[PDB]
Amino acid sequence: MKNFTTYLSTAPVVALAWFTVTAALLIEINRFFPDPLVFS
Amino acid sequence: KKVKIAVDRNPVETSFEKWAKPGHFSRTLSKGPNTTTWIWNLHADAHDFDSHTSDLEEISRKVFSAHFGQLGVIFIWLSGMYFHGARFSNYEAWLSDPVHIKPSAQVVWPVVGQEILNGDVGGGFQGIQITSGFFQLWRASGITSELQLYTTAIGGLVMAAAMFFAGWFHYHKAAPKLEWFQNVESMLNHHLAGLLGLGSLSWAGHQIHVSLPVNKLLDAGVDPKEIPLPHEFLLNRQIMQDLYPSFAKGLAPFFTLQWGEYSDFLTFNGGLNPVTGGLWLSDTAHHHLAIAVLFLVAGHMYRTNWGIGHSMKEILEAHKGPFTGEGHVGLYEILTTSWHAQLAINLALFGSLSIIVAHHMYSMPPYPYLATDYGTQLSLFTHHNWIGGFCIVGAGAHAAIFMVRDYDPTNNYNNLLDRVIRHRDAIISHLNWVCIFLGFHSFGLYIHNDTMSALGRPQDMFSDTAIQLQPVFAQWIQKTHFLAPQLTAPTALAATSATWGGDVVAVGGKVAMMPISLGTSDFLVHHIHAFTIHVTVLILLKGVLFARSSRLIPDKANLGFRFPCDGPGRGGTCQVSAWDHVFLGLFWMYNSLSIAIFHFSWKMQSDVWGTVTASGVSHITGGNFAQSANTINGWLRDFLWAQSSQVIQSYGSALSAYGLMFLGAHFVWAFSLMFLFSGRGYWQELIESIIWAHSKLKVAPSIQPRALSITQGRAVGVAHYLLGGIATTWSFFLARIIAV
Amino acid sequence: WTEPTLNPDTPSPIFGGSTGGLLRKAQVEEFYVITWESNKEQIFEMPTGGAAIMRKGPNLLKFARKEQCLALTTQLRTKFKFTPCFYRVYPSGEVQYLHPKDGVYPEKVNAGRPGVNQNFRRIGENVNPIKVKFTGNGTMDI
Amino acid sequence: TQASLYTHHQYIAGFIMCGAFAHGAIFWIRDYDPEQNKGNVLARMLDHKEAIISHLSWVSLFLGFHTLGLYVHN
Amino acid sequence: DIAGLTPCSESAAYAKRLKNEVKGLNKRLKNYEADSAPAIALKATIERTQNRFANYAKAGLLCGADGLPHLISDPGLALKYGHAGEVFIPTFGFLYVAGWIGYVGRLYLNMVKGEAKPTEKEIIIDVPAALRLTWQGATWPVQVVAELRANTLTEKAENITISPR
Amino acid sequence: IGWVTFYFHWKHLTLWQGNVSQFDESSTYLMGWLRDYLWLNSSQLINGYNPFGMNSLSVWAWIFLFGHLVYAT
Amino acid sequence: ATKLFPKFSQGLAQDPTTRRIWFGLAVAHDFESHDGMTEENLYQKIFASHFGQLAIIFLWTSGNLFHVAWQGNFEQWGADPIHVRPIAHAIWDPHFGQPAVEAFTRGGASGPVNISTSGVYQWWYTIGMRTNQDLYVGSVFLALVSA
Numbered sequence A: 001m002k003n004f005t006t007y008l009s010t011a012p013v014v015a016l017a018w019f020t021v022t023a024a025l026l027i028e029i030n031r032f033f034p035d036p037l038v039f040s
Numbered sequence B: 001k002k003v004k005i006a007v008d009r010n011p012v013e014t015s016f017e018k019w020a021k022p023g024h025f026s027r028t029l030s031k032g033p034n035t036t037t038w039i040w041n042l043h044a045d046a047h048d049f050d051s052h053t054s055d056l057e058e059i060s061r062k063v064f065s066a067h068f069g070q071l072g073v074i075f076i077w078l079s080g081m082y083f084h085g086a087r088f089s090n091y092e093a094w095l096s097d098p099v100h101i102k103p104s105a106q107v108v109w110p111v112v113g114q115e116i117l118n119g120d121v122g123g124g125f126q127g128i129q130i131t132s133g134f135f136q137l138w139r140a141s142g143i144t145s146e147l148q149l150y151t152t153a154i155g156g157l158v159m160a161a162a163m164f165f166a167g168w169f170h171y172h173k174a175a176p177k178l179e180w181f182q183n184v185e186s187m188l189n190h191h192l193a194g195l196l197g198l199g200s201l202s203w204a205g206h207q208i209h210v211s212l213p214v215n216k217l218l219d220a221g222v223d224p225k226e227i228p229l230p231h232e233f234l235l236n237r238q239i240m241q242d243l244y245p246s247f248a249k250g251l252a253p254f255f256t257l258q259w260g261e262y263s264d265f266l267t268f269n270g271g272l273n274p275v276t277g278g279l280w281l282s283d284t285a286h287h288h289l290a291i292a293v294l295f296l297v298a299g300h301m302y303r304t305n306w307g308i309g310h311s312m313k314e315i316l317e318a319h320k321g322p323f324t325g326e327g328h329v330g331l332y333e334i335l336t337t338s339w340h341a342q343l344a345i346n347l348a349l350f351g352s353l354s355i356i357v358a359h360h361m362y363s364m365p366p367y368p369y370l371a372t373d374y375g376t377q378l379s380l381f382t383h384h385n386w387i388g389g390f391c392i393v394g395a396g397a398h399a400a401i402f403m404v405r406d407y408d409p410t411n412n413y414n415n416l417l418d419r420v421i422r423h424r425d426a427i428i429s430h431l432n433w434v435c436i437f438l439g440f441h442s443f444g445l446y447i448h449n450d451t452m453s454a455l456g457r458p459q460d461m462f463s464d465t466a467i468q469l470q471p472v473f474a475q476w477i478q479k480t481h482f483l484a485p486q487l488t489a490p491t492a493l494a495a496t497s498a499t500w501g502g503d504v505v506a507v508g509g510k511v512a513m514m515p516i517s518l519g520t521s522d523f524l525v526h527h528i529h530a531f532t533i534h535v536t537v538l539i540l541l542k543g544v545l546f547a548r549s550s551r552l553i554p555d556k557a558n559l560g561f562r563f564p565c566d567g568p569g570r571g572g573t574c575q576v577s578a579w580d581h582v583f584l585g586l587f588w589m590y591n592s593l594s595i596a597i598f599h600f601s602w603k604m605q606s607d608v609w610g611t612v613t614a615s616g617v618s619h620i621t622g623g624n625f626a627q628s629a630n631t632i633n634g635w636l637r638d639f640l641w642a643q644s645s646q647v648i649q650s651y652g653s654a655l656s657a658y659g660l661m662f663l664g665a666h667f668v669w670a671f672s673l674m675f676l677f678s679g680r681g682y683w684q685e686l687i688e689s690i691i692w693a694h695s696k697l698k699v700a701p702s703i704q705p706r707a708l709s710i711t712q713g714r715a716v717g718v719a720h721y722l723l724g725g726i727a728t729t730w731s732f733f734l735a736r737i738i739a740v
Numbered sequence C: 001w002t003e004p005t006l007n008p009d010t011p012s013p014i015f016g017g018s019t020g021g022l023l024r025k026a027q028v029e030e031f032y033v034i035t036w037e038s039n040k041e042q043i044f045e046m047p048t049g050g051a052a053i054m055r056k057g058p059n060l061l062k063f064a065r066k067e068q069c070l071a072l073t074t075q076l077r078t079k080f081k082f083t084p085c086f087y088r089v090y091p092s093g094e095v096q097y098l099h100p101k102d103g104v105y106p107e108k109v110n111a112g113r114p115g116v117n118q119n120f121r122r123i124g125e126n127v128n129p130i131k132v133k134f135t136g137n138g139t140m141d142i
Numbered sequence D: 001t002q003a004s005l006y007t008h009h010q011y012i013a014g015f016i017m018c019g020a021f022a023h024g025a026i027f028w029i030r031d032y033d034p035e036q037n038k039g040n041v042l043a044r045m046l047d048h049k050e051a052i053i054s055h056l057s058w059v060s061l062f063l064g065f066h067t068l069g070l071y072v073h074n
Numbered sequence E: 001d002i003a004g005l006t007p008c009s010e011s012a013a014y015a016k017r018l019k020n021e022v023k024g025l026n027k028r029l030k031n032y033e034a035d036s037a038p039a040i041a042l043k044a045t046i047e048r049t050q051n052r053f054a055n056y057a058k059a060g061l062l063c064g065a066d067g068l069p070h071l072i073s074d075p076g077l078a079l080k081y082g083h084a085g086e087v088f089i090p091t092f093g094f095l096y097v098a099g100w101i102g103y104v105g106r107l108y109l110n111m112v113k114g115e116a117k118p119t120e121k122e123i124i125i126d127v128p129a130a131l132r133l134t135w136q137g138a139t140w141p142v143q144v145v146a147e148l149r150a151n152t153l154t155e156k157a158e159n160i161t162i163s164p165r
Numbered sequence F: 001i002g003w004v005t006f007y008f009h010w011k012h013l014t015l016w017q018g019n020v021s022q023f024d025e026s027s028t029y030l031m032g033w034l035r036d037y038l039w040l041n042s043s044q045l046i047n048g049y050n051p052f053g054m055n056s057l058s059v060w061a062w063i064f065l066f067g068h069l070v071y072a073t
Numbered sequence G: 001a002t003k004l005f006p007k008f009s010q011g012l013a014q015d016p017t018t019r020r021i022w023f024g025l026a027v028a029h030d031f032e033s034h035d036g037m038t039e040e041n042l043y044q045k046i047f048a049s050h051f052g053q054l055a056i057i058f059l060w061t062s063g064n065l066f067h068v069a070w071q072g073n074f075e076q077w078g079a080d081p082i083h084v085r086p087i088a089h090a091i092w093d094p095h096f097g098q099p100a101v102e103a104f105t106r107g108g109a110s111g112p113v114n115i116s117t118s119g120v121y122q123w124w125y126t127i128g129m130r131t132n133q134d135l136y137v138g139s140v141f142l143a144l145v146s147a
């Protein structure tokens, strides 16, 4: 597990995770607060 | 000499320790990164097993295991298609009304207004019209419900897990020894009979028991949800007997050699089914039955462990003559001790097969309600043509790799391999001359027609109205195969395809297959294809012959396959390697295939595809290929510009995704011209200035940022160049043909 | 050591012939002749294209490029660990012993070699191009 | 005429501008004396050459990433 | 007001753009049965459209004859006339996150510098320490200024390698 | 320069045809620049010489294609 | 053997390849590199080269006036500049077909001609020119200046 976690830390894996979370966050934000053209 | 299973127990251990050590495969990249190049290197050198080690036992085990995973991902892809066609699809709705309902099997989430992509494909469904021809494939498989698709999907996923397990088992557990892999006589004997022969016979079983009765009932008008389920045909002989009376006898006619009795499910009708517009399913069953007996017998030719059989090594050596020196003696070892030699030969035939399949499938639509689905036909023909063209280019690349890595001057003394490397300047020179001739005598009679038309002299042009150049040879072969069934092939009730000639198959008021007529423009476009095919071969063949040496740089073999240039001397020696002959032979492949797909797109829309009206048929473009294709302007005004209207006006409609991709494709294609027209020297220094800014604010990265290698930039540009152009055509074709 | 003299009657290796050898330059301009001494009859790869069986003892092969001869020289010096030597036969017959032209293959230091093209300053101590402008002389050479 | 005259000059102007910088680079190599120009405004330009080049990089990226992003967005 | 840009609330074209756009979806709703998922979906698109084409006007988005809302960049114009929510306020929001990302990155870079082999902590990222520095960038502006007013944000000009002039 | 001379031409073609709203709207998105400008205006030039005849714009159609040839070369 | 084409570059002159012909046309107006170049000689050569460019400009302008006068519609266009289309020159193409000869007869002519987009007409009108003679006189004058 020490070496599996090392692999899950490599750049390609970490970037895949970080982006997925960021993408999902934006998607979910528009899902509940849609059409955000202005900050009102 | 004994053919036996040889395996080494538990060779590679299964651990993640290597997973955490990037570059463990290469002695050079195991030392970690110090420049940003290592990142791009550990990927550009991960599948090159030959580079990782010198043992051909390990390289083979890696190759054998790799293939397994590939199969696994293929299964996953296939299983996903069935699942998406099981839950998110309109297959069942399409079954009832295949003509007026467009296939759809991709539904987008309702977000960022992307729900517009879910267009009204008809049948109470709003999704994305697919062009993969899976609905018509499932129909001809008998699938009449989404429970037979769900089960198949699950089965594919199970197979996937078996494949990856097999790859790990045959690598980390029971790893075959080299002596196992080098039994070519055994492989061919088992791949011809066991794989191809049994694979066809097993299909001839399904087609005869499930696909034929189900399709007959579907074409008879029976509701899909009222047809007896497949198994009932197998068990209940009465049902199958009613559909095919020959099941009243049984398997007796076969053993009694009275096969004739089975002339109701095994026939040589020929042509297309008048109801569905696709090859009769009965004829396909008979084909797979025959193809099987052939392959099964072919599997008993090469010698294995007993005595009967042939020795490929002896055969090759036996074939030598008064002009080719020693002959094919010495190729057997090359093709049993090299993976690059085998791959090259395999890719070439495999890629060519893909193009041949595309020509046959479109000419003789094999699936029900396929020809009237114009988008599916076009999308399939264009697809296979590319998939194949790429393989061929790979065949040239690996051939060169073997020449610079696995060629041994000692084994090849007077082989037809040394005797060709010894006249490379005659082969190349003559091919160069024919390319120039074909060039002027194919593209010139196009500029001539352009100039003569522009100068207002349209009687001095090369057309069916003026100086005609009809393809007489192609026009005679068309007639020898249209009148073939009445003479050459009596048993065949009709010709192989309507393309050769005859009436026009119409299904649902649309042209399934219409006799294609070849005129001056066909002659002109066909010779244009020849010129491109010849050029592409010249670039790749030149790379293979001089892959080891040439008058310029007589030691390239010692330099490698992927080496940028020997130096700026000798008046410049850039792109001398065989990788750079593959790099350029990709652009020409794109140019060669692009004209072919455009030729098919225009010819068909103009001379085949259309609606059969009272007295006459209305073609998508009103039959303007003949007079409009003899000039380059006609290919821009009546093809590119005219047919580009659908994609440029797809915005706001379900097809708006293609308009966006159409432009996005232009951007990718153009973006590629920054790596194909530039040089690292400029980027490396530019990066130096950027690093300075970073080092001032103390934000400089520990790994040294380095510009892409000379070879890398060549690869990045060609990759984006091909991706952009093909994507542009994919959007164009799909939005044009789906809209019209 | 005495600059070896070419024996133009030296057995030549066995080779059927290739459309990749000498052209008009060999006669109108010049050509080169590599020579070596084998221990056994062995197949080698020609720097022009193909394979050839070297003969036992004296061997002689002719090329139209020095790099081609030197290529074969390194091949023999490495694959067969031989000590090949090549000349430059001008159209008048003037043979000029090209390699090693000293007896000691270039890489090895040997007293009796003068220093040619040797600047005794750091590459970054060369003058500005303006100092050599209109002088028709390179900054490095000046 | 109006259209073909604007396009003519605007293109000719662009080629002329490329020549301006072009000959400027030739000046730096063929005719620049680093010892005579010592501390002059011309020699204190190469001193912050990275500053000038890098700052031109940031502006280009900013203009590029955004100008295009608001076209794809639309 | 501003540059002849009429408020979308008083923009007739904006109203037509609503009428014609909801009509184009109320003609795609008819070719579907009242309860089908196709129809539940097209009715959500009509509701979402009618909400957006009103949230915009209620935000006082001035639009031209085109009927498409326009944005004001000048801080004085945006602030003086209550158009700060467009561009102005959004500007700082990005700047804060942008500097946050950059500051956290430099914090990590300068920690792995020194540490054993700094080059192998850029490929195999130390997710633990990377997760202990993310929140440290919340008050990045406070820390960044404290570094300017201490001469530690930048490097000395006699410690940065420069290309030969 | 390509972008500047394309902006002049469209801003002005829309000015001269009287359809200023055409530019005031299509220019906002890039798709408008291609279909409403390059594709729409190219309709006549490309028809300088067609299988039915030729008009005074034949030289420009011939040059238009000639330019593409030199550019690709 | 050595050639004479690249007189300025002896290296190119001695070049046995074809590159000597290509470079000989390129390194031609880079006197600063020419074999045996003095600063004064360089300036004198450049100064004379400037005169040559000035001869071309005036000769080029004279040709435009001549063709506008000999093969143009200036007086007609001047009468109706908002209807008549300025004619640049005539198309004597020994390859033109009859439809090409017909379609290119425009702007009021008796043969195939080319309408001008240079805008010389509008300019020459505004500055005082009204007849074809004004153009002929100007062309001769500018031609003399070029000489």
Ligand code: CLA
Pocket: B012, B013, B014, B015, B016, B017, B018, B019, B025, B061, B062, B063, B065, B066, B068, B069, B164, B165, B166, B167, B168, B171
């Ligand atoms: C499932 C458990 C498992 C474990 C713990 C290991 C562990 C190991 N394997 Mg291994 N292997 C496995 C399963 C496993 N394998 C299976 C199922 C197969 C059959 C395909 C293989 C086939 C295989 C080969 C041929 C080789 C190894 C090798 C190795 C060793 C080093 C290479 C490595 O794995 O680093 C990590 C590698 C990766 C993380 C790459 C992942 C590639 C996988 C197979 C599929 C990825 C494809 C991807 C989806 C393509 C699409 C990308 C696109 C979407 C962008 C290492 C100790 C190498 C070795 O023996 O050492 C020299 C070796 O050559 N394995």
Ligand code: CLA
Pocket: B063, B064, B067, B068, B071, B180, B181, B183, B184, B186, B187, B190, B191, B193, B194, B195
């Ligand atoms: C009747 C015997 C038989 C059959 C049917 C096959 C079939 C196949 N072989 Mg094969 N082979 C055989 C005998 C046989 N072989 C013998 C005797 C040898 C030793 C001389 C080899 C050595 C060999 C090599 C080196 C390779 C193959 C490969 C392949 C696959 C081709 C790749 C492909 O198109 O994937 C298409 C996939 C399918 C058509 C689905 C069928 C897949 C099944 C599960 C394969 C089962 C084959 C096996 C003999 C069955 C027993 C397995 C059992 C022990 C669990 C294919 C499925 C290639 C490969 O492994 O690809 C991954 C390859 O690299 N074979």
Ligand code: CLA
Pocket: B043, B044, B045, B046, B047, B048, B049, B343, B347, B390, B391, B392, B393, B394, B395, B397, B401, B561, B562, B579, B582, B719, B723
């Ligand atoms: C069964 C077919 C087959 C097989 C087994 C191989 C096997 C091999 N090839 Mg190969 N090749 C093939 C077909 C095949 N090839 C074909 C058809 C072509 C013609 C295009 C090529 C052209 C080719 C070249 C030019 C090279 C190889 C090389 C190699 C070797 C190492 C490859 C590598 O480094 O992995 C690494 C794999 C990658 C780095 C992936 C590349 C990145 C992909 C392709 C780009 C993404 C494409 C995709 C459309 C992107 C989608 C969009 C994106 C945003 C996600 C390896 C043994 C290399 C070699 O051995 O030279 C010494 C080499 O340079 N091949």
Ligand code: CLA
Pocket: B432, B433, B435, B436, B437, B438, B439, B440, B443, B444, B447, B535, B538, B539, B584, B587, B588, F068, F069, F070, F072, F073
């Ligand atoms: C429009 C762009 C363009 C054009 C016209 C060509 C043309 C040609 N390429 Mg090429 N190529 C291109 C782009 C282009 N390429 C690009 C972008 C790449 C990068 C991938 C390549 C990469 C490439 C390779 C690797 C090779 C070629 C080769 C060839 C030649 C093939 C031999 C032939 O058919 O001769 C026929 C001539 C023509 C088809 C040109 C037609 C022009 C007309 C007919 C001439 C009429 C002139 C007329 C007399 C008027 C004279 C007026 C007077 C003032 C001169 C050919 C001339 C091959 C080659 O060199 O020859 C074997 C080859 O090896 N190309």
Ligand code: CLA
Pocket: B667, B670, B671, B672, B673, B674, B675, B677, B678, B682, B686, D057, D060, D061, D062, D063, D064, D065, D068
């Ligand atoms: C359509 C073709 C094209 C495009 C789009 C560009 C674009 C660009 N060029 Mg360029 N160039 C081209 C052709 C092209 N060039 C050609 C043919 C040549 C002649 C060889 C040159 C020669 C050239 C030089 C010499 C230079 C440039 C430079 C630049 C950059 C200028 C700075 C900028 O605007 O940053 C804006 C950034 C963008 C517009 C990128 C958009 C953001 C990306 C696309 C999104 C991120 C990825 C996304 C999420 C998904 C994609 C990746 C994913 C699949 C993983 C810019 C990105 C300059 C430079 O390098 O900048 C310092 C410069 O020095 N170019």
Ligand code: CLA
Pocket: E074, E075, E076, E077, E080
């Ligand atoms: C990014 C560059 C930039 C540009 C091009 C402009 C341009 C403009 N600004 Mg401005 N502004 C900027 C940045 C910029 N600003 C920043 C960063 C701030 C925050 C400090 C402000 C805060 C600001 C205010 C408070 C006002 C302007 C105003 C104006 C307009 C007229 C004022 C003037 O003469 O010069 C530019 C002025 C400044 C840059 C700041 C000083 C404030 C001005 C001088 C007071 C003028 C008031 C008066 C009503 C303006 C008459 C304009 C005329 C049409 C009647 C003008 C078009 C005026 C306006 O039109 O709003 C109603 C105004 O009131 N700006």
Ligand code: CLA
Pocket: B690, B691, B693, B694, B697, B699, D054, D055, D057, D058, D061, E101, E102, E103, E104, E105, E106, E108, E125, E130
């Ligand atoms: C800690 C990461 C980091 C930081 C703080 C910076 C900071 C900076 N970069 Mg930079 N850059 C980075 C990463 C980073 N970059 C990476 C990974 C690349 C390769 C794609 C680049 C490529 C790049 C170029 C080409 C340029 C800059 C430029 C600049 C400067 C202009 C300001 C700006 O708008 O940012 C610009 C940032 C970009 C253009 C792209 C980077 C954006 C990424 C997403 C941020 C990095 C996040 C990082 C992975 C987080 C690590 C966290 C850790 C725990 C793992 C600025 C000081 C410009 C400059 O030099 O100004 C003179 C410029 O020309 N950067």
Ligand SMILES: CCCCCCCC(=O)O
Pocket: none
């Ligand atoms: C296709 C030509 C047939 C081969 C001729 C062989 C003659 C012989 O073996 O004597």
